[PDB]
Amino acid sequence: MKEIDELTIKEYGVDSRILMERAGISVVLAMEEELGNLSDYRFLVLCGGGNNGGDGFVVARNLLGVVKDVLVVFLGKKKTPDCEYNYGLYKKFGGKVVEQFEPSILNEFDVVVDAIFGTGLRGEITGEYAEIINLVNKSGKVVVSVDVPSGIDSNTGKVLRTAVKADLTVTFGVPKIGHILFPGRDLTGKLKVANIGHPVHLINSINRYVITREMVRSLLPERPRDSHKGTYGKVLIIAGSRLYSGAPVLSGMGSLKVGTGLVKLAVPFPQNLIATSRFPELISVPIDTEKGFFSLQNLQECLELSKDVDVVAIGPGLGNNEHVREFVNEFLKTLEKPAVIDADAINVLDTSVLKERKSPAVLTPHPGEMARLVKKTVGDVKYNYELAEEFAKENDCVLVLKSATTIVTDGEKTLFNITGNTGLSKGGSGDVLTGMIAGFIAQGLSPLEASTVSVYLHGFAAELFEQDERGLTASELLRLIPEAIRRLK
Amino acid sequence: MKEIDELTIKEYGVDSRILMERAGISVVLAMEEELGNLSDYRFLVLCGGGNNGGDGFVVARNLLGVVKDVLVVFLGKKKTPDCEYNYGLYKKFGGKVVEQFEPSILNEFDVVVDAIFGTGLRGEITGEYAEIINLVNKSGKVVVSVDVPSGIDSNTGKVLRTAVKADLTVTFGVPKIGHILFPGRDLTGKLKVANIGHPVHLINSINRYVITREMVRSLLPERPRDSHKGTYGKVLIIAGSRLYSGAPVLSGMGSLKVGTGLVKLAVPFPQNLIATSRFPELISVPIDTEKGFFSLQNLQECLELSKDVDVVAIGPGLGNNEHVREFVNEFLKTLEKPAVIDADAINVLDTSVLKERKSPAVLTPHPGEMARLVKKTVGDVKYNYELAEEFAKENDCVLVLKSATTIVTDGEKTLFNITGNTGLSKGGSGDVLTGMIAGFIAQGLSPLEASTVSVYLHGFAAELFEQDERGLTASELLRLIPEAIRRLK
């Protein structure tokens, strides 16, 4: 977007002042949309010396004469040319600027407009900037942030020592990563993305995407009327153990609820019987194990079961011991079908296996599993979309890095998912998602498409739960998937 | 407004390009408000070489990539600097311009954006401009005019040989006279006035006003609870004759329905009895005349009846012969009360009388009566607000020049009324208005204020009629006045 502004000005010939005017008026219109008539409110506009603060002077100027009171507190040392131009207009139009922030000033205003820092913030905020932001956050006034709440790193969503908590953020052209990843997502409040006149070609040259309803609706596979179960694919799920008997069941129904034709589980006997007692539409093949866990002695049987399916999911509830590790790695080296690799299959995975596979794969780690897989800390990998991109590219796979915002990438295209709620922070949630992804692959979506649709729909289903989200369980999530699909259409 | 744009640029320092960008985006937002989502429509944008056409290039450019198709037909020879700048941006963004208008081109578009001429039009439109406008008017496409429909003289509302008929007109800063007076009012369709960033001080320095609901609500007199009839004033209406027995009755109830305390009519016997048989709350004094018309022999009695009132209305249904003329002029020369002068009192008026009066007056002519009073043709006086201003100023009066748009002026302030409908194009309508004005004066409004409130409310009452407007009569209008007052509050 720095690129996008520069190109719009330098190559397309749009005057910087036109962009800045459009940014500021877009903030006004956005506030009106959220507050109603603006004329009763008093506005405190906090402006830095950069272009963000310039946008703020435009906001302030456009409120003059129309609202109850406007005051600008200018907090910088110097002004960019556009900020200087708009400061001059604000004063010429009769506007009041002070250069000292006094805590009691918050008392006399209803709305604070945060135009302190935008995407130009570098480094921790200390000093009187930090004091001011902390005062604004303790004030309980309505806070509207220009472009990004001040203090959020727009590239990562990290807080740079302290940041404004906004009720409404108005950003320009495209959402920034910092609105999408946490903590920045939380500090953004309600986000509006305003069109300020960039050419639509530049806006679409973006290589990272937010997963939207329209994108997902266009990817949902077709249901031709003259179909039969084979039309919609066949999934094998290799899952479960004497310790973890529920995981197979949640993964399997995950596949069936998204429209897959046939779902087959391979589960150690007698845990396999748990599945059909709950959902008799599942096929749950008993696997004879020595001690309740898959091992190399089950390799040949699992390969045979795989010949007649379109995709294999492996990992939920497998356990992790050496014999599982030997099984998982030899199976995946030999399997010539797409694989969806989750949970304990990730914990025991030899990544050299991924590189040698001809067939595609999707990996679905949470950050703990990701950390183990690349030998880094959770803090190193969490929300680290560049690391995910590198890993997907090096291993020729799709990586679905799960968290409140989920990252889906094949190394060329990266998508961010923002559906879902904290009801998914509960055991069993991931197992359902694995099934959904396998299912969509079996129906004909590419690994990347299947992943994109599944993460969105899994989160949206959670949001359809009718009672308090903390009481959501995976079994209810399953029930809600077809509603999410209906609503998506 | 030429002044207003020049001053905003030259004194306040707003770049001409910023004004022009804001004008164009305001057209887009306005269309979206009226059409819904724009993305399905194909737009034909017709641009002249002036700043109006420049605004059109801004519209066109901002639709690129968002709607089904945009095409600009550039119809000028040369381009102003801002038009040239925005033409260049339109092309840089990928936009298509042709310089030849081909009749069949209308077939392939849904919306025509008329940015041919704005307030810069001088002289009759002939030539290929006229052919193009006539084709657009016969096309049945949706027409959106930028600033003013092309072909309307923005100072007068006259059509300059031919003009675009618009569904929607988006104008900037303030409405223009040409939107307000007919025929231009008819060609404007629905009018939106967009704020494009002029300082609110310049916008309010305007000396001519449209009469609005908010203005009228702020002028309505107060009704203190501890009041009595004298609190709300007393009106004498001198009216009627053997020929015209209904006029007194309509004028009198006009005063009572707007909240006046006491209304007294002086009417030639026995026509005076008509009034109380219909509305027994009126006082209708019998005046002994020789032949059924007021004359000098009734001068002294009418002066006596006037001593105990706040305002006198004279003229409705008086007749016009020499003896009425002698009466009317000698009465008005001697009366030291505000006068509202209507109808036959206007037809016989010696304007030298107005100049010698110490007390104020309101004159309420239709253009036929105005024409007679200044010895000009109806075409000379109709919608001629500068002539009305001159007359009000020279004669120290308020002039209410009645027509579908009514002009109210004291020579310093001029207001335009746009309430009402064709149900008021029927005998008796004017008589009610005269009573309303006298009534409001009696309640304490200045002649200008009383006139402003009355013309608005008289028109708004007409619009509240529940069946087809052509069936409205003055007697129904009376019934609707208190509803209009309620709705105004």
């Binding site: 006004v28 219109l29 009106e32 004329s39 | 305001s26 009018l191 939106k192 967009a194 704020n195």
Partner: peptide
């Protein structure tokens, strides 16, 4: 609702 437009 009137920052941009008067009816």
């Amino acid at each position: 609702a009137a920052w941009l437009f008067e009816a």
